Design a protein around this ligand. Sequence first.
Ligand SMILES: *[C@@H]1O[C@H](CO)[C@@H](O[C@@H]2O[C@H](CO)[C@@H](O)[C@H](O)[C@H]2NC(C)=O)[C@H](O)[C@H]1NC(C)=O
Ligand SMILES: *[C@@H]1O[C@H](CO)[C@@H](O[C@@H]2O[C@H](CO)[C@@H](O)[C@H](O)[C@H]2NC(C)=O)[C@H](O)[C@H]1NC(C)=O
Ligand SMILES: *[C@@H]1O[C@H](CO)[C@@H](O[C@@H]2O[C@H](CO)[C@@H](O)[C@H](O)[C@H]2NC(C)=O)[C@H](O)[C@H]1NC(C)=O
Ligand SMILES: *[C@@H]1O[C@H](CO)[C@@H](O[C@@H]2O[C@H](CO)[C@@H](O)[C@H](O)[C@H]2NC(C)=O)[C@H](O)[C@H]1NC(C)=O
Ligand SMILES: *[C@@H]1O[C@H](CO)[C@@H](O[C@@H]2O[C@H](CO)[C@@H](O)[C@H](O)[C@H]2NC(C)=O)[C@H](O)[C@H]1NC(C)=O
Ligand SMILES: *[C@@H]1O[C@H](CO)[C@@H](O[C@@H]2O[C@H](CO)[C@@H](O)[C@H](O)[C@H]2NC(C)=O)[C@H](O)[C@H]1NC(C)=O
Lengths: 49, 50, 171, 99
Amino acid sequence: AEVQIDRLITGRLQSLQTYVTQQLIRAAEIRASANLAATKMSECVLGQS
Amino acid sequence: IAYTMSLGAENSVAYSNNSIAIPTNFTISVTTEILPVSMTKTSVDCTMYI
Amino acid sequence: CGDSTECSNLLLQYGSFCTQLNRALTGIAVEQDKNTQEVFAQVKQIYKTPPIKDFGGFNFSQILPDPSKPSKRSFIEDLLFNKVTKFNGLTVLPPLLTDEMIAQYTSALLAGTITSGWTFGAGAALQIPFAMQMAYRFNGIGVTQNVLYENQKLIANQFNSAIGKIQDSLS
Amino acid sequence: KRVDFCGKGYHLMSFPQSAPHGVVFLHVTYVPAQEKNFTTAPAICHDGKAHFPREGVFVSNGTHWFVTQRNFYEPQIITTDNTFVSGNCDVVIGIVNNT
Ligand SMILES: *[C@@H]1O[C@H](CO)[C@@H](O[C@@H]2O[C@H](CO)[C@@H](O)[C@H](O)[C@H]2NC(C)=O)[C@H](O)[C@H]1NC(C)=O
Ligand SMILES: *[C@@H]1O[C@H](CO)[C@@H](O[C@@H]2O[C@H](CO)[C@@H](O)[C@H](O)[C@H]2NC(C)=O)[C@H](O)[C@H]1NC(C)=O
Ligand SMILES: *[C@@H]1O[C@H](CO)[C@@H](O[C@@H]2O[C@H](CO)[C@@H](O)[C@H](O)[C@H]2NC(C)=O)[C@H](O)[C@H]1NC(C)=O
Ligand SMILES: *[C@@H]1O[C@H](CO)[C@@H](O[C@@H]2O[C@H](CO)[C@@H](O)[C@H](O)[C@H]2NC(C)=O)[C@H](O)[C@H]1NC(C)=O
Ligand SMILES: *[C@@H]1O[C@H](CO)[C@@H](O[C@@H]2O[C@H](CO)[C@@H](O)[C@H](O)[C@H]2NC(C)=O)[C@H](O)[C@H]1NC(C)=O
Ligand SMILES: *[C@@H]1O[C@H](CO)[C@@H](O[C@@H]2O[C@H](CO)[C@@H](O)[C@H](O)[C@H]2NC(C)=O)[C@H](O)[C@H]1NC(C)=O
């Protein structure tokens, strides 16, 4: 049982790590887009560019 | 205690079609902002580690 | 593992990967909340448009909030929301700011820019009639303010038609 | 000139300082205060022609009219030197009579 459970454990751990890394990349992209949006809001709504 | 947050003070500016508001004095303000530019440089071996 | 002592005991010897995973996800969530708050929380006060609306012929009805709906959202926002369209150890956390609060920020920004112009972005909001604000804005692009005052009706008509076209295109 | 890029208010200048892994900017800006109301008109009729301000805005304290800047109260008498004329005053909405 330890042998088979270890196989399952390593597989599932690898899958979880892959998911987390993808999430981190996507979050960085979204943050860049939102920074641009904040700049646009400040410069084109509160004034004339 | 717990509550519902307040967005801020609420006011109604007195709009009209023949009235303005012109300042008569001024103030000078100095603010600060902080930005990080670099982090520590690190290196790691293999054989010494694993 | 899913509620199994043997699996958890076996996993206990793999170190502290899961603490790192939880920390990463928590950081992502906090970043999301701070991100939306930073984008939308630009003003300090909640401005309100006057009950009487005579902005030199311009018509902002389709973007001003609608008191009839409980959401207090405008026409375009309602068109937008209607257009965009379970437990194994994963949860979804709610955003810190509800939709009503975001709508309130949007209304405050729009009322402030309609009534005071760009003055409210620096200090205290200063009243000014809309036609004169538009004259300033023309003067800011190299066209003398003379031009606006002889073409007010035509400009208002063009603006209203463009707004109608936008709403039809979205609908 | 871009709004809110460096501090709140109209930007005057900035000064840099160092920090263990970064930089600190001190922004010096300008903020108006102590406003009033006055009354406004878009143009002035005289001899049947319309006058507009070269730079500023028409205000009145209740009895007499003046031209001022847009960011600091400083009334001046209305003169042909600081106004320009364009067409008869029959189309503009909000014109007032003065000299
Ligand atoms: C300018 O005129 C208005 C109108 O008489 C003055 O009154 C203010 O009106 C707004 C909106 O009706 C209220 O919120 C304020 O409380 C009123 N202030 C009063 C009654 O003192 C206003 O005070 C005048 N001055 C300025 C700087 O706006
Ligand atoms: C503009 O504001 C400044 C400061 O807010 C005023 O200067 C103050 O005047 C009072 C009364 O004369 C003094 O007691 C203070 O010490 C002054 N402050 C400083 C820093 O010297 C100034 O009078 C205002 N001007 C106008 C026209 O209102
Ligand atoms: C601004 O535009 C809206 C259109 O969105 C006008 O609302 C119309 O009003 C007339 C008469 O009140 C109605 O017959 C239409 O059915 C309305 N249209 C809609 C889409 O509801 C509104 O009247 C305009 N503003 C002003 C001041 O006239
Ligand atoms: C509006 O401004 C005018 C211009 O200063 C004021 O007229 C002067 O008022 C002073 C103060 O009484 C007199 O000494 C001058 O003789 C006036 N000049 C003229 C040409 O009349 C006027 O009093 C101001 N009105 C208000 C309500 O403040
Ligand atoms: C600003 O709005 C007011 C409010 O309607 C306008 O006042 C009206 O002006 C007309 C023409 O002079 C009169 O027939 C009405 O009786 C006035 N209304 C009231 C309630 O007395 C004023 O004309 C507008 N000023 C502009 C557009 O420059
Ligand atoms: C500004 O002055 C002109 C010139 O006097 C006024 O125009 C006259 O107004 C009276 C009163 O309605 C008429 O009987 C005349 O026929 C007008 N003459 C011309 C040449 O148009 C004008 O009314 C004044 N402005 C205001 C707001 O009273």
